[PDB]
Amino acid sequence: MNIFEMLRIDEGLRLKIYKDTEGYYTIGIGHLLAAAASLNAAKSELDKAIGRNCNGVITKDEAEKLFNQDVDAAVRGILRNAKLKPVYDSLDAVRRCALINMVFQMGETGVAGFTNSLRMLQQKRWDEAAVNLAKSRWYNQTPNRAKRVITTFRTGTWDAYK
């Protein structure tokens, strides 16, 4: 199991350019193509990015290529974040993964608003908080997601997904 695989499961994979929910183009797992207001625009972004003919469709390892970079960038944003760095640092390598998963869905701004479970989280309270997480619009919006998420946060385990 890994964040990639955790995400394949979670939001899934798209290997051909799909314009999203809010116009963006996207490929792989949430990899935004920020420079395209087109699609032709989108393929260039893309070919260029990976550096091949691609033609609006990348392999599998390619999608992981991009994701990985997405993960790193995300890690960077958290670390410069005051509400978040402390918690994150305090997390294990499994829980951090879970915390990122949350980022990939709602984004920093989002995650950050959860001013409370994070406190518990920072404070090791593995169930109180996980209990705190079920009372969120998030829990209600995406249930099998949220479940699977506060269980990587309840147990330090890929038990869920695996």
The pair of three-digit structure tokens given for residue 75, joined into one six-digit string: 């890690």
The whole-angstrom separation of Cα 158 and Cα 162 is: 6
How far apart (Å, rounded) are the C-alpha atoms in residues 103 and 116?
Answer: 16
Pair 95, 156: CB distance under 8 Å: yes
Helices 95-106 + 3-10 axis angle, to 10: 40
CB-based contacts of 68: which residues, under 8 Å, 6+ apart?
4
Distances (CA, A) of 117 to 114, 126, 143: 6, 10, 17
User: Is 20 annotated as catalytic?
Assistant: yes
Would you list which residues are annotated within the binding site?
32, 104, 117, 132
Q: Centre a 10 Å sphere on the Cβ of residue 113 and count the other Cβ atoms it contains.
A: 12
**Residue reference for tokens 């994701």:** 67
Cα torsion 127, 131, 133, 134: sign: positive
Q: Per the annotation, where are the binding residues for substrate?
A: 32, 104, 117, 132
* Cited resolution, angstroms: 2.2
Q: Which of 11, 47, 108, 128 is catalytic?
A: 11
Active-site hit among 20, 72, 92, 159: 20
Residue 134 phi, psi dihedral angles, 5° rounding: -75, -15
The coordinates were experimentally obtained by X-ray
Cβ neighbors of 119 (< 8 A, separation 6 or more) are 129
Q: How far apart are the first and last CA of the chain?
A: 6
Phi, psi (deg, nearest 5) at residue 14: -135, 120
Q: Which CATH class is domain 1-162?
A: mainly alpha
64 is catalytic: no
The per-residue DSSP string of 89-142 comes to: HHS-TTHHHHHHHHHHHH-HHHHHH-TTHHHHHHTT-TTTTTTGGGGSHHHHHS
